[PDB]
Structures are given as structure tokens and as C-alpha cells.
Design a protein around this ligand. Structure first.
Ligand SMILES: Cc1cc2nc3c(=O)[nH]c(=O)nc-3n(C[C@H](O)[C@H](O)[C@H](O)COP(=O)(O)OP(=O)(O)OC[C@H]3O[C@@H](n4cnc5c(N)ncnc54)[C@H](O)[C@@H]3O)c2cc1C
Length: 628
């Protein structure tokens, strides 16, 4: 343990650099996370640092690391037992220890003080897939793992080059090994290397620093994500998206203001009483599946950590093949062989025990999922945000935006205007109401969810059912269930429809004609909540810089043939969008808020270049332009 401190903290001059670090955030990357020893050690060091030097500018730690073969958290725990001194940190690390899914996993520890990005996979396979936003963001490197002798496999020119790419100018690195090919390899990668006495009986150790500013690669500029240098932003919003975002920004030292068109928040699509938390898995869409898996697990972690009162139960969500198409989608999902803590098959006989209700058919189950009250969540997250200093103006409806020299002029309804440095459009299905956004491949889908009274037999239902519509367990606070899914493409109408009311029960009955419990559902009270989803085909949100449609057509007019020498993606200055959350919003919103707030602050974004491109707003125009 003292050798850990020596090698990795000492080798990077961290205890000295910290209090002199002229930035709010410090970024550290690690070739393997192993048992998490190095990270815990560093975390302790960081806490001691903050405790001893409150005046210091550096308030936040960011730690990126890789593990190819993660641990079961039981083994992680009893591994952590060897170092009792670190317990108070390790416990936290365990509390949030992520599920063994591929890709990037963000953990928010110590209420944001310490951010950990765990990438599960082969580090050499993953360096390729890392996002450009990560280039030169790394202040210090822990090059660690099994000794080069006895495991040369990890130590490759690939790795050295990658470390060189991510290390910011003046950034450092340290490793326990003095091995030659490592030194010369790191020198080829562009580091300036120095030997240093090893710890105790061991021999010389290596540490170096990047003493030059290398050229930044920018592989595919049409997809690239830029932030802002300005720290003051306005959000147009009042739904879950805006709330989560505002937390994420305030956390990062942003001065935030929210304008909402309605009297209160959560009167848009986020206004439901009960809504379902679960991932959309795809076997044949890589991005979609990656994103929903990681965003779903992050979502649960986040919701657990979030210090807010909101009705909810994670009771598990069960999805039944009631017919062919469904049985088949389910089948594919089960064919992709995923950890059972994510999704697992359920036979028709087990279905009654698990859901409390007999569907007379098999299905799949997401055990970590459930229902939550989105309206209460949004409302209360916003309240928390105001405490944190969020400035909210209700009844401000944004009519149009104009770009002045250093800012954005916002023109609202009712003769009101504001002026802000940065602007984010969070406003839901109305995202397209502005000239800058009018061409976006998003569309309105109105929908109606019915509020039904609970009954002794329905009270037996322990999980959210997903069939054609969906039926939630009752929320005991109101003694009702939500049952829903009315779907109208192209419709912005929020008016109650008796047709939809009736179709909500109908779908259920139709899916389980033999089931007595289902006949219990009673919509006769004409009670429902209606809202307008903003959707895309491909089913992913649009999060990032608002692209300039015309410029994007003019430039890129060729692309194709001309893919080199291309300009960065044409974009409006300091204008970002968080939108097209679909029907899956409670799942995607937290990690999106993270991705966007990270992007705007020029910090590390917790996701790979591909899935990120899959989330990008200029997506369709760009891929159509790539060919004809
Ligand atoms: C019928 C239905 C069922 C759903 N089921 C689920 C579910 O099962 N699981 C799940 O996770 N999600 C569900 N959702 C929600 C889905 O996730 C939505 O996409 C999500 O609620 C979007 O929230 P948002 O913050 O992006 O926009 P919204 O919640 O619609 O909020 C947009 C906000 O922007 C404001 N605004 C609009 N224009 C302006 C302007 N010009 N100036 C100022 N303010 C403006 C509005 O006041 C509004 O408050 C459901 C939604 C509906 C309608």
C-alpha cells in the first residue's frame, strides 16, 4: 500500500501538484483497475488533500480506468478486506460497483466530488473506440497491471500511443516497471521519460511527462462534440431532461437559469403519475443496445444516489411475448446472452410467482427496473436545483432566438426577453419550433395514459407488465395504477380521448384474453394524463450541439469523395440540445444529462465515439451526405 502511494502518487507528483493545480477538476487515467487499490489510495489522498487545503481550486477528481475481467463485488469486497485502512472509501466503491456490461460506466461518488469511469473490456481494443473529447484531457497516468515480464500482452505501442494522445500537454505518467521496451515505447509515443529509484527492495521504476503539444487527430469531424468556455447557461425546459441537466451543470460550477412555458414544471410528457424504468435491448442495433444497457444501469445507480423524495418501486419489469412477433423479439434478446441481473427469461409458470399475476405465456425480466413517478421526480429535482442555485422563470415561453456578438438574445411571449452566453433547448416535442431547429428529424407522438382504481385482485400485481401497452403495480399513495401506451404519430393533441381510454384496457385484454385479473381493470372514470412525446426513428435521443442545417448542406455537399480536409461539424455558437427522449426518457435522461453537461464543460464524456455519434443531432443529414 505504501508502495502504491510511492509509485503512482509520488511518480506523478500528485500530493504536490494538487494544491497548485489551477483548475476545478483533475483527471487521472489507469491502464487497469485490477482490484481498485490504486483508485482507492488516490481517493483517500484526494480527501486528505481537500480536508487540509479547502482554499485550493481543485475540488473535483475524475478517474478513468479499464478492466477486462471485472470482479463480482463479493470478491471485490473480500479483496478490499486486505486493506482495512481504506474501508470507508471501499464501501462506497462497493455500494455502486457496476454490473459486468461492456463499455463505459460512470459512478458518481461523494456527491460528485469523485467521478469514476470504469470501462469493461480490453484496453487495447477500447483505445480505438474512445471519443476525441478525451484527447489531452488526462493530467496523470497510472500505467499499471501485471509485470511486463510475465505479461507483455497489455504493454504495447498501441497503449503508449493512446496514453500519449489522452495526456494533456504537461501531463504526467508513472509506472512501477523499469523495463526497456516500455521506456523506449513510451518515448516513441512522445513522452519524456526518467528512471527513478524503485520502492524498498525493488529496482528502478519509470515515470515521464508529455513535454510537447501534439496535434489533435479529429478523426470524423462531422460527428465531433464541442463545449463552451463560458460558464453561464440558460435552459428552455421544465421536464425531466431540463431538471437532470441543471443538476449536472450546477455540479460543474455553472450558473444556470431555466425558462418554462407553463405555470409549473412536469406539465409536458414528464407529467405522468407512474412510468416504467427499463432498457430497450437490441441484438442487431449495436449503438442502441449499448446505450440503453449502460444508461439503464447508470439510471438506477443515479436514482438511488439522488437525494430527492419521489414515489417509486424497483419491483422488476416483466415483458411477455403474447404472440409471435413479441416471442421472437424476446427470443433474440435472450439469444444475446446477457448477465441475469440485467435481463433473464421467465417461463409461463414462473410468471405468476414473479409478477403476482398469471399471463399464461413466457417472457423476459429486467430485475433492476420498475416504475417511478416522473412528475414528482422532475418537480423535486428542480426544487433541489434551486437550492443549488438554479434560477427558474415560469410562464416564459420562448418564441425565438437571435445571435448577438457575445451572446444569445431570447425573445419570449408576452413582451419579455433575456440575454445569455450559452443556451440549451430541453423543451420536448416543441424542440423544432425555432428556425435553428426546424429541420430536425424528430416528430411528435401524442399519447394517453389511463388512471385506474386498484382492486383486491389487481393489488396482487408485483411488477410492471410490458405487453402491447403496459400496466404498472398500484402506487399506494394514490391507490391507482397507470395503464397506457396510446400512440399517435404526428399528433400534438393532449385532449382526452375516449377512444384511447378504451384502447388502453383493450390492448391488455387482447394480449391476455383468458386472464381474469385483467378484466378487473376499469377505465370508466375517464381519468387519464395526456402528453406529447418527441421521437426519432432508430429510437435514440438527440443530444449535443444544435447543428446548422444550411451550413451542413453547403459544406459536406461533397463529403463522400472529399472525406479528408473536412471542416468541423457546422454548429450554432454556444447552443446545445437535449431532446427526442421518446417513451424511454426516465431511462436515458440521467446519462444524457451527464453526456451533455460533460460535453459542454469540456470534460470526459462517459461513452464511446460510436454510440455518441448515434446520439448526435446532425446524424441523418451526415450519414445521407456520406453517400449521395
Ligand atoms: C403517454 C406517455 C407515456 C410515457 N411513458 C414513459 C415510460 O413508460 N417510461 C419513461 O421513461 N418515459 C415515459 N414517457 C416520457 C418520455 O420519456 C418523454 O420523452 C419524456 O418525458 C420527455 O421529457 P422532456 O423533459 O424531454 O420534455 P417534456 O417532459 O415534454 O417537457 C418539456 C418542457 O419544455 C417546456 N417548453 C416547451 N416549449 C417551450 C418554450 N417555447 N419556452 C419555454 N418552455 C417550453 C414545457 O413547458 C415542458 O415543461 C411517457 C410519455 C408519454 C406522453
Amino acid at each position: 500500500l505504501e508502495e502504491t502511494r510511492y509509485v503512482f502518487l509520488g511518480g506523478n507528483q500528485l500530493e504536490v501538484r494538487f494544491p497548485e493545480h489551477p483548475h476545478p477538476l483533475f483527471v487521472v487515467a489507469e491502464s487497469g483497475f485490477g482490484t481498485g487499490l490504486n483508485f482507492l489510495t488516490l481517493w483517500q489522498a484526494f480527501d486528505q488533500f481537500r480536508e487540509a487545503h479547502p482554499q485550493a481550486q481543485l475540488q473535483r477528481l475524475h478517474f478513468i480506468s479499464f478492466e477486462k475481467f471485472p470482479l463480482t463485488r463479493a470478491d471485490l469486497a473480500l479483496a478490499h478486506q486486505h486493506w482495512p485502512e481504506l474501508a470507508p472509501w471501499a464501501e462506497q466503491l462497493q455500494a455502486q460497483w457496476p454490473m459486468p456490461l461492456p463499455g463505459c460506466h460512470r459512478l458518481l461518488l461523494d456527491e460528485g466530488r469523485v467521478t469514476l469511469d470504469l470501462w469493461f473490456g480490453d484496453i487495447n481494443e477500447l483505445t480505438s473506440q474512445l471519443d476525441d473529447s478525451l484527447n489531452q484531457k488526462v493530467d496523470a497516468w497510472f500505467l499499471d497491471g501485471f509485470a511486463p515480464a510475465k505479461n507483455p500482452d497489455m504493454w504495447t505501442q498501441n497503449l503508449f500511443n493512446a496514453m500519449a494522445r489522452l495526456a494533456r500537454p504537461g501531463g504526467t505518467l508513472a509506472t512501477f516497471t523499469s523495463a526497456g521496451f516500455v521506456r523506449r515505447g513510451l518515448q516513441d509515443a512522445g513522452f519524456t521519460m526518467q528512471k527513478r529509484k524503485g520502492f524498498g527492495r525493488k529496482r528502478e521504476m519509470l515515470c515521464g511527462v508529455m513535454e510537447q503539444t501534439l496535434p489533435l487527430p479529429c478523426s470524423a469531424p462531422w460527428f465531433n462534440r464541442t463545449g463552451s468556455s463560458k460558464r453561464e447557461a440558460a435552459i428552455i425546459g421544465g421536464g425531466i431532461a431540463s431538471a437532470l441537466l441543471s443538476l449536472a451543470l450546477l455540479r460543474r460550477g455553472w450558473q444556470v437559469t431555466l425558462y418554462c412555458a407553463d405555470e409549473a414544471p412536469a406539465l409536458g410528457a414528464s407529467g405522468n403519475r407512474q412510468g416504467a424504468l427499463y432498457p430497450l435491448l437490441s441484438k442487431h442495433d449495436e449503438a442502441l443496445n449499448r446505450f440503453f444497457s449502460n444508461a439503464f444501469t447508470f439510471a438506477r445507480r443515479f436514482y438511488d444516489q439522488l437525494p430527492v423524495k419521489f414515489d417509486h418501486d424497483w419491483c422488476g419489469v416483466t415483458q411477455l411475448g403474447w404472440d409471435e412477433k413479441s416471442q421472437h423479439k424476446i427470443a433474440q434478446m435472450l439469444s444475446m446472452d446477457l448477465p441475469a441481473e440485467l435481463a433473464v427469461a421467465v417461463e409461463a409458470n414462473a410468471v405468476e410467482q414473479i409478477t403476482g399475476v398469471a399471463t399464461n405465456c413466457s417472457g423476459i425480466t429486467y430485475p433492476q427496473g420498475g416504475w417511478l413517478c416522473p412528475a414528482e421526480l422532475t418537480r423535486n429535482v428542480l426544487e433541489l436545483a434551486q437550492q443549488q442555485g438554479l434560477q427558474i422563470y415560469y410562464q416564459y415561453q420562448l418564441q425565438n432566438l437571435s445571435r448577438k456578438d457575445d451572446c444569445w438574445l431570447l425573445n419570449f411571449a408576452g413582451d419579455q426577453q433575456a440575454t445569455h452566453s450559452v443556451v440549451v433547448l430541453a423543451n420536448g416535442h416543441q424542440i423544432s419550433r425555432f428556425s435553428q431547429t426546424s429541420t430536425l428529424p424528430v416528430y411528435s407522438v401524442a399519447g394517453q395514459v389511463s388512471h385506474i382504481p386498484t382492486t383486491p385482485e389487481l393489488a396482487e400485481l408485483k411488477q410492471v407488465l410490458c405487453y402491447d401497452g403496459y400496466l404498472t403495480p398500484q402506487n399506494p399513495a394514490n391507490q391507482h395504477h397507470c395503464i397506457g401506451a396510446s400512440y399517435h404519430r404526428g399528433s400534438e393533441d393532449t385532449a382526452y380521448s375516449e377512444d384511447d381510454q378504451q384502447q388502453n384496457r383493450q390492448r391488455l385484454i387482447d394480449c391476455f384474453p383468458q386472464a381474469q385479473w385483467a378484466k378487473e381493470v376499469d377505465v370508466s372514470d375517464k381519468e387519464a394524463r395526456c402528453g406529447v412525446r418527441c421521437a426519432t426513428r432508430d429510437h435514440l435521443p438527440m443530444v449535443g450541439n444544435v447543428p446548422d442545417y444550411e451550413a451542413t448542406l453547403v459544406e459536406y455537399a461533397s463529403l463522400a469523395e472529399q472525406k479528408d480536409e473536412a471542416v468541423s461539424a457546422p454548429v450554432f455558437d454556444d447552443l446545445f440540445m437535449f431532446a427526442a427522449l421518446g417513451s424511454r426518457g426516465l431511462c436515458s435522461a440521467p446519462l444524457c444529462a451527464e453526456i451533455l453537461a460533460a460535453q459542454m464543460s469540456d470534460e470526459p464524456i462517459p461513452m464511446d465515439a460510436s454510440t455518441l455519434a448515434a446520439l448526435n443531432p446532425n446524424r441523418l443529414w451526415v450519414r445521407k451526405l456520406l453517400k449521395g
